């Protein structure tokens, strides 16, 4: 994967561009909001080697947090603004893409 530096720390990986999963939120309305806005959300995740964690939840938390930090930084310079709903939705889709990444790392091991 590509090596990356985020927030002045290296050792991150940037995954491939992924097919973002459709997420369900428990209302048709929010589902359709997601479909209409998902292009604004990440489709690539930042992660660290599996060996830097003792458990999956910590791997995935870092991947969610840093991805959304980096995305928010780079997109705010191009004029983006995210609402509370956007942030919640990004946390869910990025969490699924980070779990997929964890599975890929765990099968490689």
């Amino acid at each position: 994967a590509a090596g990356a530096v985020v927030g002045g720390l290296g050792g991150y990986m940037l995954g491939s561009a992924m097919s973002r999963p459709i997420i369900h939120f428990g209302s048709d309305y929010e589902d359709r909001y997601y479909r209409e806005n998902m292009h604004r959300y990440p489709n690539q995740v930042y992660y660290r080697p599996m060996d830097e964690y003792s458990n999956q939840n910590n791997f995935v938390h870092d991947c969610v947090n840093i991805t959304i930090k980096q995305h928010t930084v780079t997109t705010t310079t191009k004029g983006e603004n995210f609402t509370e709903t956007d942030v919640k939705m990004m946390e869910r889709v990025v969490e699924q893409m980070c779990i997929t990444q964890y599975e890929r790392e765990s099968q490689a091991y």
Epitope: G7, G8, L9, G11, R48, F59
Partner: nanobody, 123 residues
Framework: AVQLQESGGGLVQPGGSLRLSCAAS????????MGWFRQAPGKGREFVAS????????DYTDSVKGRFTISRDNAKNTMYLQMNNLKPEDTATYYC?????????????????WGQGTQVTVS
Amino acid sequence: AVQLQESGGGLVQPGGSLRLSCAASGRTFSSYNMGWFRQAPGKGREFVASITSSGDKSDYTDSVKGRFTISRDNAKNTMYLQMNNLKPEDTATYYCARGLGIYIIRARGGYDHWGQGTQVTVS
């Protein structure tokens, strides 16, 4: 070279309480995020909790959330870990560390300046 020293370890009964301290030498304590990790024999060094430079945000591994509390005294070059409701699975050497970069993370690669550790044994 900033150095960090853990203290406060010991033998504690299940359900009991201990407070660890991390003291830093130097004059840049408040400029850096900080964290606590733990290592038991047969396991690697794993995330426990972290706190930003200012104290504005903290983070915990899931197994300690609600039981342990990280804090820092920026005027005294000291970080603390209050550990409540201790369990046998919490037995480990506890290490404090200084954050790398501007973001607190859970990865072992996100910190350096490791102390020599303090041993916590929960009967």
